[PDB]
Amino acid sequence: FRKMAFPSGKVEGCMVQVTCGTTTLNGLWLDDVVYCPRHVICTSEDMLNPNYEDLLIRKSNHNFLVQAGNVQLRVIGHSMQNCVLKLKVDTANPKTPKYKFVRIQPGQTFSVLACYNGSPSGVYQCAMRPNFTIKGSFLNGSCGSVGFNIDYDCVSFCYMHHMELPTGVHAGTDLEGNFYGPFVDRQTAQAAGTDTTITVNVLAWLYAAVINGDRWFLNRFTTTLNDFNLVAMKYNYEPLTQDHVDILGPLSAQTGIAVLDMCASLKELLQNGMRTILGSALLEDEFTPFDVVRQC
Amino acid sequence: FRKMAFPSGKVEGCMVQVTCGTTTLNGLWLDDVVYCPRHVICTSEDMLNPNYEDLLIRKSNHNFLVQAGVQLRVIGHSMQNCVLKLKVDTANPKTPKYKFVRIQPGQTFSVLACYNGSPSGVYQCAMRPNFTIKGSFLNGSCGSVGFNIDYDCVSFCYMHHMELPTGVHAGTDLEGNFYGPFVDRQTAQAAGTDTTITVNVLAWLYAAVINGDRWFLNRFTTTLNDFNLVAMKYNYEPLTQDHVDILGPLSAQTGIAVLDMCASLKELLQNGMNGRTILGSALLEDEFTPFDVVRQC
Ligand SMILES: *C(=N)Cn1c(N2Cc3ccccc3C2)c(Cc2cc(F)c(F)c(F)c2)c(=O)n(-c2cncc(C)c2)c1=O
Ligand SMILES: *C(=N)Cn1c(N2Cc3ccccc3C2)c(Cc2cc(F)c(F)c(F)c2)c(=O)n(-c2cncc(C)c2)c1=O
């Protein structure tokens, strides 16, 4: 099992650079709007205590340098939605894919196209941690890099990168500018919550093992969902939602192993602790049910 | 600290489907040529024991259906080793600046897995010492390519031909020469004994330090020769002085001498990791090059 990213071409053709004064970052050019972190309107000194509504009333269209490579796109309007700036430009991007904006749930994976100075540099898969951070690989200059899934040539944008936190993990927003997690776009004492294991994905990984004939850990037991959730938390595992149970349905059907039967199996692995699964001693939690199917 | 592939856009616009009869796979369209595995000309029966010069002479241009998202008309064909080259009537307008390179064992590249001419996923792989690669390829992935990108120039280094019985992958360069002792015939084929890419493990241990993980370091040193004795014992590749040189930047950056890191690795091979993990792994990772680490650290 490999972490496979989606082909990045469709997103590559949407990446631009946005500059306010000396502050620069990446933006995303879809039709005639460029989306980017609103913190582009800040000097580094302003970050210590920014008032965005004011910094923005005082900006004008002509203050924003938007560039696709070295070609300037003239801005004809500006607004902010939550923590994202939307710059209306005078050119509709001919390379705009079919797209939507999605707000993903913790556990969901997506591809990150890391970008510097509007120029894509690399692509990799990432999971949204339960504590609403991502364990990304971002260097300074990466703000405005985006995360996405691709579903029949429709690009679902789910993440825009804003910042690195103290412990070296990453935080940002959806494409409506709403942060994942409790973070804010100003310099404070902010820290990631204590993280937990993504139970839904661990179960998907157990289904993957079963599909491949690796099924020693299956037992005769079943559990109630409520009982499972209470025990799981004792081992720093996430409780399951109804949505989780549902996205495990296809793998449940493929293997004929009921979700709550697999939960029983997991509970035992937790209570006794293991002997390998898919030739690994560790339970993997960054492959979703959809990832498992997409690979097998 | 993740495996990071190159952005795949420039390659995506070169992928096409090639079909002969009910045999289909992917092709790479550059200028007015489509490169694909020559085994496209075989039925399953032919593929059991193919005489390719003899099969190819019997084909006409119109036997080849090339599809680019538009049918492209084939106007000429030739074979170069295990790669078929179909000249087509239309030049690919999105051809990047490109080269064909043969990679060295230990080196990494991005794979763009494709099915029916359509890109499906992108990830990094290394060319293993035994000249296989551990890809994520399913049925129909033949003709998917591997590449590196340097300032907009795409260097293609791999074209995918088969999965071996063990679940690893084998293929050719873009000149159609196999990596490893394999052939393009349906017969059971094993690779030689694989070994671990030592220089890469060392690069990855340096990565782990740069990312704030230091539990495996020790105060000890070793000579190159004595390290290599231990490494060969554990089916690791020899570390050369050129490798030590290559590691110079990461050594400079962490203030750990290469031979000091080698002493750490020796202890890891001898003692195991006990309970522990390094950059999330329970296993010593060997598929990041020094260059890959630098490009990210
Ligand atoms: C983003 N492309 C640059 N950057 C920043 N910033 C530098 C800067 C300069 C002027 C004005 C604002 C900024 C932000 C940060 C810092 C940052 C980001 C926020 F959202 C905040 F709310 C904040 F208080 C500070 C940053 O963390 N990174 C970053 C992202 N990912 C990885 C790394 C190593 C660094 C930036 O790139
Ligand atoms: C490739 N897109 C199809 N394929 C093949 N082949 C199926 C087929 C049908 C008719 C004629 C020729 C072929 C080859 C193989 C089999 C194969 C190919 C070789 F070159 C060999 F030397 C060999 F021993 C076997 C194949 O392995 N894969 C493949 C690739 N990667 C992963 C998986 C699961 C399968 C094909 O896709």
Nearest residue (by CA) to ligand 1, atom 1, is: A143
- What are the residues whose beta carbons fall under 8 Å from the beta carbon of A189, sequence distance 6 or more? none
- Residue A143 known to be catalytic: yes
How many other C-beta atoms lie within 10 A of the C-beta of residue B174? 24
Q: Which structure tokens are listed for B41?
A: 């000309």
Number of residues assigned to chain A = 296
Cα(B133)–Cα(A235) distance, integer angstroms: 37
Active-site choice (B20, B36, B39, B161): B39
Pairing of strands B74-80, B83-88: antiparallel
B32 phi and psi, to 5 degrees? -105, 30
User: For ligand 1, atom 24, which residue shows the shortest CA distance?
Assistant: A187
Q: Minimum-distance ligand to the CA of B132?
A: 2
Q: What's the CA gap between A23 and A58, in Å, rounded?
A: 16
| Distances in whole angstroms, Cα of residue B270 to Cα of each of A279, B234, B267 | 21, 9, 5
B146 to chain A, any CB pair closer than 8 A? The answer is no
Q: Dihedral through CA A264, CA A269, CA A275, CA A277, nearest 10?
A: 60
State whether the Cα torsion B251-B257-B261-B262 is positive or negative.
Answer: positive
Q: Which residues line ligand 1 (CB under 6 A)?
A: A 23, 25, 39, 42-44, 47, 138-143, 162-164, 170, 185-187
Method for structure elucidation: X-ray
C-alpha–C-alpha distance, residues A105 and A108, integer Å: 6
How is residue B10 annotated by DSSP?
H
CA distance B231 to B284: 13
For residue B225, give the 3-state DSSP assignment.
helix
Half-sphere exposure of A153 (CA within 13 A, CB side): 7
Resolution (Å) of this entry:
1.9
Q: What residue ranges line ligand 2, CB within 6 angstroms?
A: B 23, 25, 39, 42, 44, 47, 137-142, 161-163, 184-186, 189
Angle at A130 between CA A127 and CA A131, to 5 degrees: 110
User: What SS3 state is found at B160?
Assistant: strand
C-alpha Rg value of chain B to the nearest Å: 22
Q: Is B83 helix (H, G, I), strand (E, B) or coil?
A: strand
Chain A CB within 8 Å of residue B291 CB: no
Distance of alpha carbon B236 from alpha carbon B198, whole angstroms: 6
Residue reference for tokens 């996923």:
B121
Amino acid at B199: V
Q: Are A150 and A6 within 8 A, CB to CB?
A: yes
Q: Of A5, A114, A294, which has the smallest distance from its Cβ to B123's Cβ?
A: A5
What CATH number is associated with residue B73?
Answer: 2.40.10.10
- Rounded to an integer, what distance in angstroms lies between the CA atom of residue A239 and that of residue A134? 19
CA of A47 to the centre of ligand 1 (A): 9
**Strands B108-115 and A23-30, bridge-based pairing:** unpaired
Torsion angle, alpha carbons of B133, B134, B138, B144, to 10: -40
Torsion angle of C-alpha atoms A108, A109, A115, A121, degrees rounded to 10: 180
Secondary structure (3-state) at B293: helix
Known catalytic residue at B142: yes
Closest CA to A157 of A246, A27, A294: A27
- Alpha-carbon gap, residue B131 to B178, rounded angstroms: 9
Which CATH number covers residue A259? 1.10.1840.10
Q: What is the DSSP string of chain A?
A: ----BPP-HHHHTTEEEEEETTEEEEEEEETTEEEEEGGGG--TTGGGS--HHHHHHS--GGGEEEEETTEEE-EEEEEEETTEEEEEESS--TTPPEEEE--PPTT-EEEEEEEETTEEEEEEEEEB-TTS-B-----TT-TT-EEEEEETTEEEEEEEEEEE-TTS-EEEE-TTSPBSTT--SS-S--------B-HHHHHHHHHHHHHTT--TT--S----HHHHHHHHHHTTBPPPPHHHHHHTHHHHHHHT--HHHHHHHHHHHHHH----BTTBSSPP-S--HHHHHHH-
- Dist CA B99 CA B83 (whole Å): 16
Query: How many other C-beta atoms are found inside a 10 Å radius of the C-beta of residue B42?
Result: 21
Distance between Cα A246 and ligand 1 center (Å)? 37
Backbone angles phi, psi at A206, to 5 degrees: -65, -40
Domain that holds residue A262: 199-295
